[PDB]
From a paper:
Presentation of antigenic peptides by major histocompatibility complex class II (MHC-II) proteins determines T helper cell reactivity. For MHC class II (MHC-II) molecules, which typically reside in late endosomal vesicles, the noncanonical HLA molecule HLA-DM (DM) acts as peptide exchange catalyst. Typically, DM encounters MHC-II in complex with a class II-associated invariant chain peptide (CLIP), the placeholder peptide derived from the invariant chain (CD74) that assists MHC-II proteins during folding. The MHC-II proteins HLA-DR, HLA-DQ and HLA-DP are heterodimers consisting of a highly polymorphic β-chain and an α-chain showing little (HLA-DQ and HLA-DP) or almost no (HLA-DR) polymorphism.
Although these complexes cover a range of thermal stabilities between 64.1 °C (DRB1*07:01) and 87.3 °C (DRB1*01:02), they all show essentially the same three-dimensional fold. Although we see no significant differences in ground-state structure, we still expect polymorphisms to influence CLIP affinity and exchange, as they may alter the dynamic properties of the peptide binding groove. Interestingly, all allotypes retain the capability to sample the same conformational states MS3 and MS1, but CLIP affinity and pMHCII stability alter the occupancy of states of the individual allotypes.
Author numbering:
A (entry chain G): 6 to 19
B (entry chain D): 4 to 104, 112 to 132, 135 to 165, 169 to 191
C (entry chain C): 3 to 180
The structure:
Amino acid sequence: SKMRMATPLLMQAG
Amino acid sequence: QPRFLWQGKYKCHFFNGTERVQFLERLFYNQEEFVRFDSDVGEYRAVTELGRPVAESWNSQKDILEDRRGQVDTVCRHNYGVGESFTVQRRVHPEVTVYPAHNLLVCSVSGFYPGSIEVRWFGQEEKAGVVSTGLIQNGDWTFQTLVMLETVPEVYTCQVEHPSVMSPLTVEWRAR
Amino acid sequence: EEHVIIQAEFYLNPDQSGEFMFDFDGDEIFHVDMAKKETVWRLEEFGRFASFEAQGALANIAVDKANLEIMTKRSNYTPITNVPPEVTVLTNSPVELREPNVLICFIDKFTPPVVNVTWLRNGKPVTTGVSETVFLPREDHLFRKFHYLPFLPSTEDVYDCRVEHWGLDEPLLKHWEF
């Protein structure tokens, strides 16, 4: 029932 | 005023359902693809110079690669099951009509889903001289197509075969 | 190749505008309205078979905004090269006099994803029953967009789709007649 998604990766750690 | 655009595309490619699945991640800056994760390679690969240190940082992290390598099962294969009934298994009947457009006979096929369709002109069917505008996507889960016939010229019949309709749909035409 | 599902998201500066959608074989399954924190199914019936937590898309777009801001610096504040749209006004079915129909304005092959689309009947703008899609993805990573106008075909009425884009030197106006 629940559609999932790919999460974007963070390029830098701040 | 200056504009800056980011684009993220996460593609799940299914080849015969969940038997063969590939996950493809592509990142874009100002329309230009700079880095990508192809599941068939299992690592990030640069497309342009900006993606070189980007792919370098992510690939050096075991946790990042294992997350990206498991996308085929956790997201791709999971989502195929969730949407299967209303997308893959969606069937909407075509609406068939015949009219002339010099002589050129038109077969209008409308509102059907999915896109896969067989449109044949027929006594004996004619295979040569049956130009088509092509498959047109209406952007609302329906397709439309016009299949013409360079004729001079007898009753002409348009036969339509689609996965929604069990028997072939036919529309006859005669001028007065 | 059997079936393709694309999760397409974007973020645009300085407009601070983001979008998130799912595409199945060239058709939209749903999108997330960032302003309403809402999952919008392309066909209402889709929300009866599946669900999507809109919050996840908003957190994705925040990451897109952060990454865009990093990438903008790394490029030394280099901007998008604008591509103007080619626009077409058509119907979804053969047009019949006094038979309800829908005019569709197809705005294609453009970037950035910002447009000003207006429908007009006999000159005057019309907003009655009008509807529109989000910025839909193309394989050349440009955008396409659909604008819809329900109408009762006549032999007297004249229709136009006016589109404004930054890549256009002049606002495009595509004419439609029965």
